């Protein structure tokens, strides 16, 4: 949904729309490394809390992701 | 009467887990002296007391199960 709007009016749009896509991308990343948190919960949480879930998930994956990129380089 | 006792004990249990030094259920100056309380030692003392009790019972189970084990061995041998 965020892709559709962005392609400067997102201020008028409810931040719920942007938040749902955050769950999609990160869960794909979480489900990717599966193949700290099983899901990024977006229900009833502000952006900072959702971000806080994102940071913890993203921080842990960084160590392995950077190592792999060197291999593929 | 029992439910109240259960309520106090349940609330009492949380007090030890989160606020050890605080007194149990049954200002500026208080701030610093509470801040200087060495709660960590209280946690260590309780952990050791619980650990000993668990250690003490476990040996009795070990000591007990050896007695019955040997008796079973006696009968099977006979």
């Amino acid at each position: 949904e965020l892709f559709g709007v962005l392609k400067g009016r997102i201020i008028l749009k409810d931040p719920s729309a942007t938040s749902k896509d955050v769950k999609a991308y990160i869960d794909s990343v979480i489900n990717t490394c599966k193949n700290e948190l099983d899901e990024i919960t977006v229900d009833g949480l502000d952006a900072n809390q959702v971000w806080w879930q994102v940071k913890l998930v993203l921080d842990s994956i960084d160590g392995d992701l950077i190592q792999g990129i060197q291999e593929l380089k | 009467q029992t439910s109240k006792y259960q309520a106090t004990s349940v609330v009492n249990g949380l007090l030890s887990n989160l606020l050890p030094g605080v007194p149990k259920i049954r200002n500026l100056k208080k701030r610093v002296q509470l801040q200087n309380r060495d709660v960590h030692k209280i946690k260590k003392k309780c952990k050791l007391v619980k650990k000993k009790k668990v250690k003490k019972h476990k040996l009795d189970k070990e000591q007990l199960e050896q007695l019955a084990k040997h008796q079973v061995l006696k009968k099977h041998q006979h």
């Binding site: 700290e36 919960t41 | 029992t2 609330v11 007194p23 500026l28 208080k30 668990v54 019955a68 079973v72």
Partner: protein, 391 residues
């Protein structure tokens, strides 16, 4: 006549059951059968079934007891529980919980199950997984009896507190769902045990409990609003402490996610009249050492002008003072510069109390003295550039 013989009759049973030689003690004979491989499994079942009837019988008298005989039955009850091991004890007693039709017998039965694990170790983890599952299945059945509902939750509270991490996660998540549902229970006791159960669950689960976070903090606040209203509630102190201890539990485990609703936590701490100051001050110190201070300074202005400014409560004001001194003496130089316009906005408010404060002169004077030293603290650790427009 009749009662004297019953006194002596239970004296007779106590002598036999007493574990005063391998042959004499009943307890050892049971384990020998259990240890023996060749011993028939049906006979093992007989002992389990025979014991369950025996444990039911002794509890029946204790429920339906006469002080001296009441004492002896406990001497007998001490003996029966130790006849057989924990593993068989759980297998032999858990089905009986459903079978027993007497709430008093179920009442005592749930207690003894917990006492068996009070002194157990990691060997009981698979067994406890069985007990937790059964206890969870029984709670919907036992909603009618408050005492039974309360005790069952308490046993769960004990079991999650002790090696709760080693318990399987699915039960841990299931228990949290149950407790959050039961916090809404009208009976105050059900709330308190549910409140405690959430704490141990949240402590074990940590960040993983964030999914239920909408279902924990907002109901807890709304509970406190009712708690103040019903100051006739006999469990008000027990209830109020339960609410604060929840925040203390999660303030240590999920400090970051609580930053949003930190405001209403401060409301609970300040207005929790029944709870003692030492409890309230103790939980306050957790907030400073665990939560970002910058958010605290912003909210401190809001919580003040709305509620504590007109509260005219000595305890609430003093607690507010304790927070303010704690924050400024810990806040960083860089951060202190950032939140300065908010702080000075508070400081102008802090000075204007003598207009609106209803207390006597001495208290108002002491409050201002505390303001000035803390204001002296904040204005230090800064530079001229930030200060000159503020001046």
């Amino acid at each position: 006549e009749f009662l004297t013989f019953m006194n002596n009759t239970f004296e007779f049973i106590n002598k036999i059951t007493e574990e005063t030689d391998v042959r004499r003690n009943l307890r050892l004979k049971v384990y020998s059968v259990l240890l023996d491989e060749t011993s028939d499994k049906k006979l093992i079942r007989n002992i389990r079934e025979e014991f369950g009837t025996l444990l039911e019988g002794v509890l029946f008298f204790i429920n339906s007891v006469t002080t001296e005989i009441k004492e002896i039955l406990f001497k007998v009850l001490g003996n029966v529980l130790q006849i057989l091991p924990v593993d068989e004890f759980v297998n032999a007693v858990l089905p009986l919980l459903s079978t027993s039709t007497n709430e008093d017998i179920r009442y005592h039965l749930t207690l003894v199950i917990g006492s068996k694990f009070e002194l157990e170790g990691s060997e009981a983890i698979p067994i406890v997984n069985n007990v937790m599952k059964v206890l969870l299945d029984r709670m919907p059945l036992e909603s009618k009896s408050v005492v039974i509902s309360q005790v069952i939750l308490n046993t769960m509270t004990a079991l999650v507190s002790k090696y709760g991490k080693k318990l399987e996660g699915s039960i841990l998540t299931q228990a949290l769902t149950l407790a959050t549902e039961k916090v809404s229970s009208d009976m105050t006791e059900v709330k308190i045990s549910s409140l405690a159960l959430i704490t141990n669950c949240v402590q074990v689960l940590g960040v993983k409990s964030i999914a239920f976070y909408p279902k924990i903090v907002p109901p807890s606040i709304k509970l406190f609003d009712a708690s103040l209203a019903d100051s006739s509630n006999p469990l008000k102190e027990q209830l109020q402490v339960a609410i604060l201890l929840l925040f203390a539990g999660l303030i240590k485990r999920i400090p970051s996610f609580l930053m949003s609703n930190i405001l209403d936590v401060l409301h609970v701490i300040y207005f929790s009249r029944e709870v003692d100051s030492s409890i309230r001050l103790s939980v306050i110190s957790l907030i400073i050492e665990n939560i970002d201070l910058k958010e605290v300074l912003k909210v401190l202005f809001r919580i003040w002008s709305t509620e504590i400014a007109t509260s005219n409560d000595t305890v609430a004001v003093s607690l507010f003072l304790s927070t303010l001194e704690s924050t400024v003496e810990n806040i960083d130089k860089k951060s202190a510069t950032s939140q300065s316009p908010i702080f000075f906005k508070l400081l102008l408010s802090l000075f204007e109390f003598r207009s609106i404060s209803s207390f006597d002169n001495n208290t108002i004077s002491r409050i201002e003295a505390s303001v000035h030293e803390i204001s002296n603290s904040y204005v230090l650790k800064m530079n001229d550039k930030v200060f000159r427009p503020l001046f």
